[PDB]
Design a protein around this ligand. Structure first.
Ligand SMILES: CC1(C)O[C@H]2[C@@H]3OS(=O)(=O)O[C@@H]3CO[C@@]2(COS(N)(=O)=O)O1
Ligand SMILES: [Zn+2]
Length: 258
């Protein structure tokens, strides 16, 4: 029972066990749309998930992970500000107790109802564990969620949450296509940052899509029915598992669009 998102173990407490929490390149951050500068040196973003192989979904106590077989370059992210190939290992979300909060990154200080994170590791480092020890070890694709119409591509995810309500529970999740969670446009903002959960390693190149995807109230409400706790323990609804914006410090957020 280490860190968490509560009053006594949340984000403001993390620095104690993880000093880097107060580092020079921490995530998330607020994205100032007026200050972000168009970067013409950015290469076209390339998301290739046609051969993605989903395997299982797991409730890890602070979020749920949809894992993918990454033993091969089946689903990768390249281009944009990245050099090399980054392999998709899993995707997860961060959400709130209410629609007005839940996203980790913010846009002009605006918080979205949730935020999808598709985690990829630089194949040049061999495995995920070694990549996190490198400044350019990971590339995380962030996609904001706003409440409106339902997202067809997300329902299969929503429907299985009933089977992994508590910590430690997992369920088979093969044959799920992550392309169903992407918005139409790939316009994005990018900057060098870190993991948003301990160990908060500063090994991430963040790519945050400007266009949010719409999900229905019914869909988000199901996310809020998950538990932080393990089976048979007092219920602690899994909500507000997001780290607030951190100081930008010596960084510049670049935009892929003019
Ligand atoms: C599941 C979740 C949020 O936990 C985090 C842990 O960071 S870690 O690199 O030590 O390994 C775990 C898996 O990756 C993460 C990455 O989260 S994130 N929010 O930075 O994208 O995803
Ligand atoms: Zn995340």
């Amino acid at each position: 029972h280490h860190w968490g998102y509560g009053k006594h173990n949340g984000p403001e407490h993390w620095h104690k066990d993880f000093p880097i929490a107060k580092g020079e390149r921490q995530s998330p951050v607020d994205i100032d749309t007026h200050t972000a500068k168009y970067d013409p040196s950015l290469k076209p973003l390339s998301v290739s998930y046609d051969q993605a192989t989903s395997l299982r979904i797991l409730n890890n106590g602070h979020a749920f992970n949809v894992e993918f077989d990454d033993s091969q370059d089946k689903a990768v992210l390249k281009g944009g500000p990245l050099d090399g190939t980054y392999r998709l290992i899993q995707f997860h979300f961060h959400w709130g107790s209410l629609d007005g909060q839940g996203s980790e990154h913010t846009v002009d200080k605006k918080k979205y109802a949730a935020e999808l994170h598709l985690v990829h590791w630089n194949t040049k480092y061999g495995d995920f564990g070694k990549a996190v020890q490198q400044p350019d070890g990971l590339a995380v694709l962030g996609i904001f969620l706003k409440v409106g119409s339902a997202k067809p591509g997300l329902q299969k995810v929503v429907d299985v949450l009933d089977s992994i309500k508590t910590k430690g529970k997992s369920a088979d999740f093969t044959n799920f296509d992550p392309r169903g969670l992407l918005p139409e446009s790939l316009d994005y903002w990018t900057y060098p940052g870190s993991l948003t959960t301990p160990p908060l390693l500063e090994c991430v190149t963040w790519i945050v899509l400007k266009e949010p995807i719409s999900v229905s109230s019914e869909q988000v409400l199901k996310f809020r029915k998950l538990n932080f706790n393990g089976e048979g323990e007092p219920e602690e609804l899994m909500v507000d598992n997001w780290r607030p914006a951190q100081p930008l410090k010596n960084r510049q957020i670049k935009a892929s669009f003019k």
